[PDB]
Amino acid sequence: MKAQELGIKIGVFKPGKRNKITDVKGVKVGHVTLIKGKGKLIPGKGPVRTGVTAILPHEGNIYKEKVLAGAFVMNGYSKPVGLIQLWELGTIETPIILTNTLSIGTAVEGLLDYILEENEDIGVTTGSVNPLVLECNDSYLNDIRGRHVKREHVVEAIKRADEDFEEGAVGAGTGMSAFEFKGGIGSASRIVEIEGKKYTVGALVLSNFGRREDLTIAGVPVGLELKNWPGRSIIMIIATDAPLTGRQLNRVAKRAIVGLARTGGYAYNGSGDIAVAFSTANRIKHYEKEVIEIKALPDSVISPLFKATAEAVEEAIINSLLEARTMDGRDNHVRYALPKEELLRIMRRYGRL
Amino acid sequence: MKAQELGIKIGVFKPGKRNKITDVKGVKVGHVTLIKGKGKLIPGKGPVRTGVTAILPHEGNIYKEKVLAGAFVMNGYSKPVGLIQLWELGTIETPIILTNTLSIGTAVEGLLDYILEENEDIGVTTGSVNPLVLECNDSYLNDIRGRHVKREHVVEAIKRADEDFEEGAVGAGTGMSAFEFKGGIGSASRIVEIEGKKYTVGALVLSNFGRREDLTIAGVPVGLELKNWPGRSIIMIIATDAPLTGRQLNRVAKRAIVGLARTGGYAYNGSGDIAVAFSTANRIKHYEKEVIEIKALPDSVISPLFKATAEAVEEAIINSLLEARTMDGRDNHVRYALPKEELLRIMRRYGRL
Amino acid sequence: MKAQELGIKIGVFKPGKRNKITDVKGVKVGHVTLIKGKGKLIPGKGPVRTGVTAILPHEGNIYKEKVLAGAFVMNGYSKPVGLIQLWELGTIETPIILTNTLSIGTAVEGLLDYILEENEDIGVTTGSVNPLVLECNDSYLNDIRGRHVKREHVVEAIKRADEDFEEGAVGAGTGMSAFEFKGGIGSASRIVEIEGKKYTVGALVLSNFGRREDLTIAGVPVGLELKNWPGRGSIIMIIATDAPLTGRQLNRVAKRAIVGLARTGGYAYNGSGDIAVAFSTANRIKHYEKEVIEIKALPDSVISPLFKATAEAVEEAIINSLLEARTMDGRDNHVRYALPKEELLRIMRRYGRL
Amino acid sequence: MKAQELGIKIGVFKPGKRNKITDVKGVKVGHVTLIKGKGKLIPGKGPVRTGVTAILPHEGNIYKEKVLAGAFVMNGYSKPVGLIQLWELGTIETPIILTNTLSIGTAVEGLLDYILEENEDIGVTTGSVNPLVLECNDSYLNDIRGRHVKREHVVEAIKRADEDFEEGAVGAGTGMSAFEFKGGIGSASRIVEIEGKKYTVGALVLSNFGRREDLTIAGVPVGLELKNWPGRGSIIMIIATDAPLTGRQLNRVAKRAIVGLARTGGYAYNGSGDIAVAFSTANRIKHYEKEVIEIKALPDSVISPLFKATAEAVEEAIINSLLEARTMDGRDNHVRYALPKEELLRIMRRYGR
Ligand SMILES: [Cl-]
Ligand SMILES: [Cl-]
Ligand SMILES: [Cl-]
Ligand SMILES: [Cl-]
């Protein structure tokens, strides 16, 4: 299942009750999984191995009630939508959508179907809207040229978002590959106490990176040890309830790369590594016109959040592997789930259980 | 009718043959205009006042033969698609599409339709593709909530790209507003001689910014003079044949803001001002594995290009006004074309012309 | 003097009482001018035409009580000191120092002299300090290789800082050139009302850029009209405001300064170090703060007036740097003449603008 | 000794002959170590524990013959000089100097003493010069307030620059602390073959970060294993390579340096000044060049090996800075022990290493 149930300890901070990004009160996650067909690749028909994942900053109208946010592009061989305004205004005003590289257009169409329905004032009595869509390429297993994600799928994922969500090869992670093993959706969280108050840092990742040899789990070179085992980009979403300004949240997003690096993420040329981070502490009203007060921790005290963020991403990445199920896709390509029995053998070998 | 016609001098460099971005050998522009209905607004129905404009770096295959590119975001209240990879790899691998803010999704779909058709390897034997889509909000005259742009329109605009192209309220500029006058597409070019060699700098703009009183034409406060005339963001595309690296083209893109400002562009909070610059000098092969030789001017001699960029952008913005025609739209809104007759009296009144 | 007293109107917002960056209550400016020698250049000796200019965000301890700040590099052919931390932490914790390109090291030394004197805990019980120094190249008139600026000059400039301050060829502006006329220090301010509240936007510029023919004053190509005026042969913009704004917002404000620059004929040529630094006096950040703080800040949807006021203050500030500059000779008998004001009135009149 | 020879294997790429940044031919490194006094801290007097370290891109005039370069700021709690021009022009035109935070002004004076002496035209017939200076805070062991570094020390460090240089507590690393052990200069190199051609990637670090328990060596939690080990109580990474690359590409390589940092337990806490500077010796840019030049550059699609190698070089270099450091006492009788070699080899073996 997850790292802890296998005796694998990542970091020093304790996890949240769910040990998921939803440990941040109000955060919701929904999926729509699309699996169909088997065999030779039939460009435009299948096999289909993809889906949609939605992340909701909170339970209400994200456009009317925005949240401060930040983001960092470790390597831009990615096709994200909406980061420019996010950086300019420091806010997120729509649910966060994740899907495959060739379905971002479709995703935007679906995300808008949802947004416009919730806000009929957009484009008439008020301004436009900044849909936020990020992705990963699931071409190894999925008929990506087919663009099998439908606009209704995006609305469905949003409406399905809940506190508890499945991990592994579901939603946007359905046909993803990592370390030449089955990748996908992974999640984890951490609790930290700063000047008396307890804050939560959650992480949800869409893993689809690394060569088999790069895999590093709790410092153990499992990847190298699994060199010839059969079967032969990443979006990191960070959420926290700690009060932070948009500038600070860009700092937070950078730290996600620390957890990425520790699992063997080298950010090769073609790996779209991007991190988005937001806080639920300050809600920005779309129509506000008077001076406001933004609650924020002084930078001198947020180091714990920086570390917890690295820890969260690192385990989240590992969890996407531990939760993934073996899978076959286009052209009979197969991606086996990281072999858990062999993994335990290796962890004990390097005395780390 | 353009600046020259009225006898208005902008800058000191001479224009190109056509005085259009297409003066840069190989560059082509195509439009698709959507006009329909009138009267009160009927969301999802009309009146319709929008379209699509496409800019092709060269007449070949853009994905297979990429061109170095740079870009600058003056104010990010914009929803551009594809800038992250552009900055990361310093290249543009698809035609450039412009349209309205709420149709970027559809634009992506339409662009992918064309791209996938031209490249069968994408998503099968090679990686994905980074569609480049920029936009401006035409809500004042257009039923933007209706998303009347269709994916076929994108493909059509591309197939229509030609050396010669219309300006004013066409393509993406169909329903645009500028200085509370009719805005839209505007273009211009300049020739510069650097160390014996002649280079061309072209600019195409999609004007949709400024208050009435902001308008500055060749230094004259035209906006203030016509403050009482009835009718009460911007994308700048820069092209050149001068050899430049991706870093240098980021610099070039910034210089376009010099021209924007001179016409009275202040980059208000809600104005999405973005500039993208590319060179036709170096062709980057998608499948290249051998060391290459990138041709580039030393930075100490490119100041003329920085200037020419500002000039073309400034005149292009003015041209979009001079080439626009009066038009009515949703809720009976109307944008008058800048009265050229009155303009002349004002110019002459300020010692100009 | 200033554009106002000449009838030259720039922008639509009204200026502050003094029409200087110090109209932002608490802000202070001090100068140290170095002029000596004449004739042939004797590298290391003179002629000397340089100086130092200090800008204090407020009147107390800037390190212990920081101000939120932002900045934008239009063209990085510049050697600024202190911007990386400004961007990372969003704050300014030292007075702002301007001087010539090759004196930045000396400026840092002097600035630290002042700072360590005022804070004995630095380097012992607390962290270090991020000195903020910016510059322009005055080589055309100054023996820049000689590094005539002395560390004490930096401390002096800081202790001379106050509300009233001279403009033109003084302090860091002493040996600068702009549009092939004498350049230097220029300043101006604008008042704006946002949601029933008055806010001031002030600007101080160190002009040292432009070709003679680029000069644009209130839309009039004053540069071309004065093509043949004798003397033929880089810029830092400091923005201050009392409006509450976060670091991110102050980076936005910094960018708007370029609009004003462009309007006077600034094209940011290859070798022109064009940089803008913006800060607010509305939110003071205590060095040792540990409790959650409340940052006062205007919603982005209502700050466009500040963007315009910024561009305005910068545009006039640049012109004032020319109007306030007095003719000056320098190394190798090089000379830059002050923009002829009576001539300027004539040109403005010919274009029906006065 | 260094890691490689101790038997500690980091990464999968082989190291250069010296396993130092100078394996990139032409690069040199010089130090000036200042050690004086002991006991209680007498501000401005001592004890002195600091110095200067100079890195030369090549053997000639760096100003007249510049090298292309890039840089990345992981966390800006640093006071670097020269990065703005580096990013704008993509070049380095002076030797690189490292010293303590409060000595940056002195380093500028010193570096300028050297440059102006070697370049008589600067400030007279040509432009100015961009001094490159970076730093770390050695206040725990050194009387930093005293600014004991003198301008002559800088000129000296530059002239002592050699292929063979000492590591550990020398030069700018003299008084540095890492993981609450002795820190300082560390270096390593990796050789990678790309398209039948071998390139070298070297790295020199100045370590001054991390809490005891953060220490990660070859994936082993040595930090936690030495939690209660005595002596309890930022980082600049310099990357060099002979691979041909543009400024943009070198900014990318600079970023990869953080991967190695993270893997040793670098979390970039709030007050940690973590910065990477990368340059190539492949292309020299003539100061007075006025004609179209040809930049030799490797296509991005084939540079991933350099990205991983950069990660490895930094990771091992950080470790070598610890292995080469010697125990030291300083101001206020503070002491920093060198990582216990025998105990470390013991801990490693205890984890199958
Ligand atoms: Cl913010
Ligand atoms: Cl490039
Ligand atoms: Cl902030
Ligand atoms: Cl370059």
Short mmCIF file of N, CA, C and O in Angstrom, two decimals, chain D residues 270-317:
data_model
loop_
_atom_site.label_atom_id
_atom_site.label_comp_id
_atom_site.label_asym_id
_atom_site.label_seq_id
_atom_site.Cartn_x
_atom_site.Cartn_y
_atom_site.Cartn_z
N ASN D 270 15.31 28.64 5.34
CA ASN D 270 15.14 30.06 5.10
C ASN D 270 16.41 30.90 5.00
O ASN D 270 16.56 31.71 4.09
N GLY D 271 17.33 30.71 5.94
CA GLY D 271 18.55 31.48 5.94
C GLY D 271 19.71 30.87 5.16
O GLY D 271 20.84 31.33 5.27
N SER D 272 19.44 29.85 4.36
CA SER D 272 20.53 29.22 3.61
C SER D 272 20.71 29.79 2.21
O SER D 272 19.86 29.62 1.34
N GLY D 273 21.84 30.46 2.01
CA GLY D 273 22.14 31.03 0.71
C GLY D 273 22.68 29.96 -0.23
O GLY D 273 23.88 29.69 -0.26
N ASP D 274 21.78 29.35 -1.00
CA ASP D 274 22.16 28.30 -1.93
C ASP D 274 22.11 28.79 -3.39
O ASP D 274 21.03 29.06 -3.93
N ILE D 275 23.28 28.88 -4.02
CA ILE D 275 23.34 29.34 -5.40
C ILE D 275 24.31 28.53 -6.27
O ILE D 275 25.38 28.12 -5.83
N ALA D 276 23.92 28.31 -7.52
CA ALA D 276 24.75 27.55 -8.45
C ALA D 276 25.11 28.40 -9.65
O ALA D 276 24.27 29.14 -10.17
N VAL D 277 26.36 28.30 -10.08
CA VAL D 277 26.85 29.04 -11.23
C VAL D 277 27.52 28.03 -12.16
O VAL D 277 28.43 27.31 -11.76
N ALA D 278 27.07 27.98 -13.41
CA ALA D 278 27.63 27.04 -14.36
C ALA D 278 28.21 27.72 -15.60
O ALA D 278 27.63 28.68 -16.12
N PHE D 279 29.36 27.23 -16.06
CA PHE D 279 29.98 27.80 -17.26
C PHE D 279 30.66 26.74 -18.12
O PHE D 279 31.00 25.67 -17.65
N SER D 280 30.83 27.06 -19.40
CA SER D 280 31.48 26.14 -20.33
C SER D 280 32.73 26.79 -20.90
O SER D 280 32.76 27.99 -21.12
N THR D 281 33.76 25.98 -21.12
CA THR D 281 35.01 26.48 -21.68
C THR D 281 34.98 26.28 -23.19
O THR D 281 35.88 26.73 -23.90
N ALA D 282 33.94 25.61 -23.67
CA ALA D 282 33.78 25.31 -25.09
C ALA D 282 33.74 26.53 -26.00
O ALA D 282 34.28 26.49 -27.11
N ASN D 283 33.11 27.61 -25.53
CA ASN D 283 33.01 28.83 -26.33
C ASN D 283 33.57 30.08 -25.66
O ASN D 283 33.16 30.43 -24.54
N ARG D 284 34.50 30.74 -26.33
CA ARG D 284 35.06 31.98 -25.81
C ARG D 284 34.44 33.12 -26.62
O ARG D 284 34.37 33.07 -27.84
N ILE D 285 33.97 34.15 -25.92
CA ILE D 285 33.34 35.30 -26.57
C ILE D 285 34.27 36.51 -26.53
O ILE D 285 34.57 37.02 -25.45
N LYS D 286 34.72 36.96 -27.71
CA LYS D 286 35.62 38.10 -27.80
C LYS D 286 34.92 39.40 -27.44
O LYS D 286 33.91 39.76 -28.03
N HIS D 287 35.48 40.11 -26.47
CA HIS D 287 34.92 41.38 -26.01
C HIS D 287 34.66 42.33 -27.17
O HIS D 287 33.58 42.90 -27.31
N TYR D 288 35.67 42.50 -28.03
CA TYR D 288 35.55 43.42 -29.15
C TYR D 288 34.93 42.85 -30.42
O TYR D 288 34.87 43.53 -31.44
N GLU D 289 34.46 41.61 -30.36
CA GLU D 289 33.84 40.98 -31.53
C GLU D 289 32.66 41.81 -32.03
O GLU D 289 31.79 42.20 -31.25
N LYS D 290 32.61 42.06 -33.34
CA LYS D 290 31.52 42.84 -33.91
C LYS D 290 30.80 42.11 -35.04
O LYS D 290 29.77 42.58 -35.53
N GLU D 291 31.33 40.97 -35.46
CA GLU D 291 30.71 40.23 -36.55
C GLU D 291 29.98 38.98 -36.11
O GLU D 291 30.19 38.47 -35.01
N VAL D 292 29.11 38.49 -36.98
CA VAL D 292 28.32 37.29 -36.72
C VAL D 292 29.26 36.18 -36.30
O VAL D 292 30.24 35.89 -36.98
N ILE D 293 28.96 35.55 -35.17
CA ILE D 293 29.80 34.47 -34.69
C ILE D 293 29.03 33.17 -34.72
O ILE D 293 27.83 33.15 -35.00
N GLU D 294 29.73 32.07 -34.46
CA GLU D 294 29.13 30.75 -34.44
C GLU D 294 29.32 30.15 -33.05
O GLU D 294 30.45 29.95 -32.62
N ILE D 295 28.21 29.89 -32.36
CA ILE D 295 28.26 29.29 -31.03
C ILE D 295 28.11 27.79 -31.16
O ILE D 295 27.12 27.30 -31.68
N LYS D 296 29.11 27.05 -30.70
CA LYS D 296 29.02 25.59 -30.76
C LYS D 296 28.05 25.19 -29.65
O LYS D 296 28.21 25.61 -28.50
N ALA D 297 27.05 24.39 -29.98
CA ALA D 297 26.09 23.98 -28.97
C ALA D 297 25.53 22.60 -29.21
O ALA D 297 25.22 22.22 -30.34
N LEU D 298 25.40 21.85 -28.13
CA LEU D 298 24.83 20.52 -28.16
C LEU D 298 23.32 20.67 -28.11
O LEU D 298 22.81 21.54 -27.40
N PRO D 299 22.59 19.86 -28.89
CA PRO D 299 21.13 19.95 -28.87
C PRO D 299 20.62 19.49 -27.50
O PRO D 299 21.18 18.57 -26.91
N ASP D 300 19.56 20.13 -27.00
CA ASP D 300 19.00 19.79 -25.69
C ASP D 300 18.61 18.33 -25.54
O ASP D 300 18.75 17.74 -24.46
N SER D 301 18.15 17.73 -26.63
CA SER D 301 17.73 16.33 -26.63
C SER D 301 18.84 15.35 -26.23
O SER D 301 18.55 14.21 -25.87
N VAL D 302 20.09 15.77 -26.27
CA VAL D 302 21.17 14.86 -25.92
C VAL D 302 22.00 15.25 -24.69
O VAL D 302 22.99 14.60 -24.38
N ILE D 303 21.58 16.30 -23.98
CA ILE D 303 22.34 16.74 -22.81
C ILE D 303 21.92 16.18 -21.45
O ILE D 303 22.47 16.59 -20.43
N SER D 304 20.97 15.26 -21.42
CA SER D 304 20.54 14.69 -20.14
C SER D 304 21.70 14.08 -19.35
O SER D 304 21.75 14.18 -18.12
N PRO D 305 22.66 13.43 -20.05
CA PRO D 305 23.77 12.86 -19.29
C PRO D 305 24.53 13.93 -18.51
O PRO D 305 24.97 13.69 -17.39
N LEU D 306 24.67 15.12 -19.09
CA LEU D 306 25.37 16.20 -18.40
C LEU D 306 24.56 16.64 -17.17
O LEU D 306 25.13 17.06 -16.16
N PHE D 307 23.23 16.54 -17.26
CA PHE D 307 22.37 16.93 -16.14
C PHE D 307 22.58 16.01 -14.95
O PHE D 307 22.66 16.48 -13.82
N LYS D 308 22.66 14.71 -15.20
CA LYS D 308 22.87 13.76 -14.11
C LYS D 308 24.29 13.89 -13.56
O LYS D 308 24.49 13.91 -12.34
N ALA D 309 25.27 13.99 -14.46
CA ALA D 309 26.67 14.13 -14.07
C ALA D 309 26.86 15.34 -13.16
O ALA D 309 27.64 15.30 -12.21
N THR D 310 26.15 16.43 -13.46
CA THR D 310 26.22 17.65 -12.66
C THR D 310 25.73 17.34 -11.26
O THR D 310 26.32 17.79 -10.27
N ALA D 311 24.65 16.58 -11.19
CA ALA D 311 24.04 16.18 -9.92
C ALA D 311 25.02 15.35 -9.09
O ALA D 311 25.15 15.56 -7.89
N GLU D 312 25.70 14.41 -9.75
CA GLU D 312 26.67 13.54 -9.09
C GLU D 312 27.88 14.29 -8.59
O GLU D 312 28.33 14.09 -7.46
N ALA D 313 28.42 15.14 -9.45
CA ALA D 313 29.60 15.93 -9.12
C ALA D 313 29.36 16.77 -7.88
O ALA D 313 30.20 16.81 -6.98
N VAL D 314 28.23 17.47 -7.83
CA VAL D 314 27.90 18.30 -6.67
C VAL D 314 27.72 17.44 -5.44
O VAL D 314 28.26 17.75 -4.37
N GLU D 315 26.97 16.34 -5.57
CA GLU D 315 26.73 15.48 -4.42
C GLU D 315 28.02 14.99 -3.79
O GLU D 315 28.19 15.06 -2.57
N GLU D 316 28.94 14.48 -4.62
CA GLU D 316 30.20 13.99 -4.09
C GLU D 316 31.05 15.14 -3.58
O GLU D 316 31.72 15.01 -2.56
N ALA D 317 31.04 16.26 -4.30
CA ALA D 317 31.83 17.41 -3.87
C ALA D 317 31.43 17.84 -2.45
O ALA D 317 32.29 18.16 -1.62
#
